[PDB]
Amino acid sequence: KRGSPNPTRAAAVKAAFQTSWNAYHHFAFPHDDLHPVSNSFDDERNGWGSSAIDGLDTAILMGDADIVNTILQYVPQINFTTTAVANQGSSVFETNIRYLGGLLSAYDLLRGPFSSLATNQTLVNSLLRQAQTLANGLKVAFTTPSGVPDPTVFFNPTVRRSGASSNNVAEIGSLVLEWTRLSDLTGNPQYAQLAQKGESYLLNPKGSPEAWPGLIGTFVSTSNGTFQDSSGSWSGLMDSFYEYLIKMYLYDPVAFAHYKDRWVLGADSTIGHLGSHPSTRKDLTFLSSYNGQSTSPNSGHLASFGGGNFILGGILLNEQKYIDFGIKLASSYFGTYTQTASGIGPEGFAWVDSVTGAGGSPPSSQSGFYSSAGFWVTAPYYILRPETLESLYYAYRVTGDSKWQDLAWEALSAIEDACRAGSAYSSINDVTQANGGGASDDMESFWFAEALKYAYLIFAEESDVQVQATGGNKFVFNTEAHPFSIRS
Numbered sequence: 271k272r273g274s275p276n277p278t279r280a281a282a283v284k285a286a287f288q289t290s291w292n293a294y295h296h297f298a299f300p301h302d303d304l305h306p307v308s309n310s311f312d313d314e315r316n317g318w319g320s321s322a323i324d325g326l327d328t329a330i331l332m333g334d335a336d337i338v339n340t341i342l343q344y345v346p347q348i349n350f351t352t353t354a355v356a357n358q359g360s361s362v363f364e365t366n367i368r369y370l371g372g373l374l375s376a377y378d379l380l381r382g383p384f385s386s387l388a389t390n391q392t393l394v395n396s397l398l399r400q401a402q403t404l405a406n407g408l409k410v411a412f413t414t415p416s417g418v419p420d421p422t423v424f425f426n427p428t429v430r431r432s433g434a435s436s437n438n439v440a441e442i443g444s445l446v447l448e449w450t451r452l453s454d455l456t457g458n459p460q461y462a463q464l465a466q467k468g469e470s471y472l473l474n475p476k477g478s479p480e481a482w483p484g485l486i487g488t489f490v491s492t493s494n495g496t497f498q499d500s501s502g503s504w505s506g507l508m509d510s511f512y513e514y515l516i517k518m519y520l521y522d523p524v525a526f527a528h529y530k531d532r533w534v535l536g537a538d539s540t541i542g543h544l545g546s547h548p549s550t551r552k553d554l555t556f557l558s559s560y561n562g563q564s565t566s567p568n569s570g571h572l573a574s575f576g577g578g579n580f581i582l583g584g585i586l587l588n589e590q591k592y593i594d595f596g597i598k599l600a601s602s603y604f605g606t607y608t609q610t611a612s613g614i615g616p617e618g619f620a621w622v623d624s625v626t627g628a629g630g631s632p633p634s635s636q637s638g639f640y641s642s643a644g645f646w647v648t649a650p651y652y653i654l655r656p657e658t659l660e661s662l663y664y665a666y667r668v669t670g671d672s673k674w675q676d677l678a679w680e681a682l683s684a685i686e687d688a689c690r691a692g693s694a695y696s697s698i699n700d701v702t703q704a705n706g707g708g709a710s711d712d713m714e715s716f717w718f719a720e721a722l723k724y725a726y727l728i729f730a731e732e733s734d735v736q737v738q739a740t741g742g743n744k745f746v747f748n749t750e751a752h753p754f755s756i757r758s
């Protein structure tokens with residue numbers, strides 16, 4: 271059953287985005303996030319207008335001229351040289367992937383194959399200008415003795431480092447894509463130099479021994495860039511590091527060929543050592559976490575992005591093995607969606623390793639559920655994450671099998687039927703509950719940038735943004751689903 275764009279399906283996703291935007295624009299804008307039930311807002315993203323920037327490119331790919339214009343008019347107004355709140359900490363990582371990524375992807379799209387969605391060239395130019403302004407403040411993060419970025423900085427009263435003594439590999443290794451992109455766009459090499467230097471310490475790990483070739487530790491010293499542990503996983507604190515390794519290779523196969531080699535070691539090592547099968551459902555394959563040569567039968571929604579990453583690597587390297595493994599991953603993680611009462615996957619889940627017998631024991635209430643489902647829930651909530659829709663999307667782009675679109679559709683449908691709340695959509699309390707267990711009154715910006723973006727693209731018409739299975743990709747998605755043009 272060969273696939274093809276599904277207008278009806280794509281329209282539904284576009285409609286969910288429209289609703290979410292209207293509500294956000296009316297009750298929260300220009301604040302960072304909307305609380306759909308109370309109709310209030312928050313500024314978790316330092317009050318720069320997180321949801322507006324994060325959703326900008328999604329609005330461009332959907333052909334939402336009006337929404338695009340609204341945001342473009344706002345960009346020049348943002349003040350990326352300070353924070354409304356004095357002495358307020360700023361996450362180098364979160365700020366980078368959302369703001370810098372969002373501004374750069376919008377810039378690349380509005381100057382590339384989507385330039386029609388914008389007429390005012392001065393507004394388009396603001397995106398890049400504002401990105402450089404932001405980066406000029408964020409760069410203080412690299413003023414550590416080793417060059418390894420400090421995870422937190424401050425802009426108000428002045429630009430300063432938090433002074434942390436260590437950081438995690440995910441936050442250190444998820445800056446290279448957008449900072450290198452910025453240098454290429456501005457002509458100022460400093461940005462790339464800074465990010466790449468901090469990254470260098472992660473490519474030739476010194477200190478704690480690698481659990482396995484390519485599988486590095488989680489925390490790195492800011493004073494000397496050495497590792498102090500041998501633990502890690504494909505989820506929180508490490509996930510996006512492995513992701514950007516292969517993505518940099520897409521951005522420029524020559525300059526970052528070494529990044530590609532570090533990915534292959536990681537990939538091969540997680541396949542031979544992290545792949546785990548639930549004792550009650552051997553046909554399923556999940557990724558365990560690790561510490562030394564020991565692995566733990568636990569995972570969650572964050573690690574579900576893995577499927578798409580292995581697939582991406584298989585495309586860029588013409589290696590079926592990575593594609594097959596990625597397909598299995600996408601499928602297995604979707605099983606945590608399709609088997610709950612709401613049809614939505616849990617935040618955290620666990621199982622019993624079928625080989626080492628490791629892992630706990632299903633809590634009494636989930637005893638029967640584990641027997642047939644192959645996992646039990648440890649963290650029931652869902653906050654509109656996109657990792658699974660992301661992996662399903664890659665699975666479809668590489669196979670062309672409409673079956674994947676059906677799974678994604680089942681995923682989007684389950685999500686809106688339970689997350690539909692107040693003026694738009696919201697995080698839910700209990701996924702193992704048919705109705706979702708009640709909304710927690712929150713609509714994260716990545717709902718706009720990622721979940722709705724991947725859901726739409728899997729049903730949408732062809733374009734340069736779509737990932738090409740037979741190579742020739744001209745774009746690369748950053749960790750927050752913001753596509754950048756490759757070096758060229």
Ligand SMILES: *[C@@H]1O[C@H](CO)[C@@H](O)[C@H](O)[C@H]1NC(C)=O
Nearest residue numbers: 347348349350351352353426
């Ligand atoms: C941005 O904020 C800083 C500090 O409050 C201020 O000095 C500057 O004038 C502001 N810039 C704009 C464009 O208002």
Ligand SMILES: *[C@@H]1O[C@H](CO)[C@@H](O)[C@H](O)[C@H]1NC(C)=O
Nearest residue numbers: 343346389390391392393396
């Ligand atoms: C947008 O383009 C118009 C041209 O019609 C220009 O007058 C305006 O200044 C631009 N936006 C801003 C305020 O930078």
Ligand SMILES: *[C@@H]1O[C@H](CO)[C@@H](O)[C@H](O)[C@H]1NC(C)=O
Nearest residue numbers: 435436491492493494495496
């Ligand atoms: C590196 O710095 C850390 C502090 O973060 C310290 O514990 C460690 O001993 C240093 N390593 C060496 C040998 O320089």
Ligand SMILES: [Ca+2]
Nearest residue numbers: 510575749750
């Ligand atoms: Ca991500």
